[PDB]
Structures are given as C-alpha cells and as structure tokens.
Amino acid sequence: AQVINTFDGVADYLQTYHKLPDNYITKSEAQALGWVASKGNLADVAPGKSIGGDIFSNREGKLPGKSGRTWREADINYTSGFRNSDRILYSSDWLIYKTTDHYQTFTKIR
C-alpha cells in the first residue's frame, strides 16, 4: 500500500474510487494542527502526508467550466517542505488537468 501523489497515479485513483487517497488533508485541517505555510512546516506537523482536496477556484478561466462546476486541487510530486507548483486539478464531473507552472498553463490528461 504505497502512497500516491503522482499526476497519473492520482488521476486514475480518482476515476476509480471517486475520491482522493486519505493521505491528503485540507489547508483547514493542516492549519488546525498548527501547520504554517509560512513556516513551511507541513512535513513537520504531518510527516508523509500531503495537501489535497482543497478548492482551486478557477477564477482565471485557465481551466474549463461554467459556474455549477467546481474545481479541486491536489499536491503532485510532494516530498517535503512548502507547497509546490506541480498540482493536479480535477473537477466534480471528472475532467482532469495538470500544471507544473503554478497556474500558468494546463494540459488535459483526462
């Protein structure tokens, strides 16, 4: 039962079970635990676990959608430290994109 936080790995797992792996928390939960993004210390309050399931809020229109549709994000390629640029996007209707450039540009994978 290896941890899953790759692009393709998370994509597939979503399409299957219609959820994350429960190694992802929310920014909310993290913070409660005393995580400070500004202290960078996600791996210290929650060693081995990642962020995921949070909202992305496609306000920029970089992803597709309308209004009823929401987007979520999840950490890709997480190791330790701060939150990175690599993140998987997946909507409720199960479009998936990726981005490796901190919400500059996205590529459709599913």
Question: What are the DSSP calls for 27-75, one per residue?
Answer: HHHHHHHT--TTTT-HHHHSTT-EEEEEE----S--S---SS--EEEEE
- Output the CA angle 65-67-96, nearest 5 degrees: 30
Q: How far is CA 83 from the centre of its chain?
A: 10
Catalytic one of 18, 29, 60, 102: 102
Half-sphere exposure of 106 (CA within 13 A, CB side): 20
Domains of the chain: 1-110 (3.10.450.30)
73 in catalytic set = yes
First to last CA, the chain: 24
Q: Which of 19, 68, 18, 73 is nearest to 51 (CA)?
A: 73
29 in catalytic set = no
Catalytic one of 18, 29, 60, 73: 73
Give me 13's structure tokens: 């797992």
Other beta carbons within 10 Å of 105: 11
